Write a protein that binds this ligand. Sequence first.
Ligand code: HEM
Ligand SMILES: [Ca+2]
Ligand SMILES: [Ca+2]
Length: 306
Amino acid sequence: QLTPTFYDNSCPNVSNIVRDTIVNELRSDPRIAASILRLHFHDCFVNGCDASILLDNTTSFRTEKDAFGNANSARGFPVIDRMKAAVESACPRTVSCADLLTIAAQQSVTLAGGPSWRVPLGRRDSLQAFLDLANANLPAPFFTLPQLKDSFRNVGLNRSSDLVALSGGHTFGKNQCRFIMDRLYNFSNTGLPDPTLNTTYLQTLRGLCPLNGNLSALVDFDLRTPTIFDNKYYVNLEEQKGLIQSDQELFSSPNATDTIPLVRSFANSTQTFFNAFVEAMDRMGNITPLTGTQGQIRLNCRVVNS
Ligand code: HEM
Ligand SMILES: [Ca+2]
Ligand SMILES: [Ca+2]
């Protein structure tokens, strides 16, 4: 069983070292907190939170970094290497990369103004990476609500609260124009924009992402508070201002009978959202972990120990 006190004797300073690393990085890269939370999400949705996403290519298995949901998108790997080295110096061969990334995600959320809590620990590192599984399990922005629900259920998160609360991760961070081009100019082959996108915001987004423009251009997920972790993401949805299709469907999908009340509840109360986010985060962090003597305590998060 995972426990928040796992390193209280072997490495009581691990959380502080992780925090310091992120604080320093945030000065030159204000997007790193968001990037790190996303790395944890993409780690957990593929064979569980086992740091499999951190592994680089080998001649026997491909890296998950080349998955459709990670390639030219996932970032912050060098920052993880940095905190891992700092932690390895303070506590040799003690903290797994899987746990390190989990702590990094929580600290990132807190540093951005979100809730503060101690995450369950005791996870161990995978002996391989899963590219095919990553391509199959990571949800895409063009997924319908039923598809989003299916994706979460597939990895073990059955609750609509899991989906709505965790989607709150889009309260900060960046998104490439490529992922909303259809919503802006030709949605579902209708030759028209997505009707669930506020028309005033549509104009703004079209200006940032013109047709035939730079598809890699970045746009803020939350137009209200782009870098602050808060409940503004849900207020946006209520106004049809969710950035990607998967965001807005939580409020506008024909299948949103169960998610709409959750969106409203989180928009109406920061406390309600924060409580739900921590609850959902710990549930995601509990997805099929390797524990005890299973797996290893990876020394270099990019490669399996030898
Ligand atoms: C519900 C399904 C979800 C879908 C389809 C989805 C999709 C996306 C997409 C398309 C991007 C943009 C990537 C890019 O343009 O490079 C992204 C970024 C991001 N996502 Fe999600 N996401 C989902 C759930 C989540 C969850 C559960 C979390 C975390 C709890 C999360 C956290 C983030 C963050 C923080 C960013 C910004 C990362 C950065 O700026 O580096 N996402 N997501
Ligand atoms: Ca994983
Ligand atoms: Ca925000």
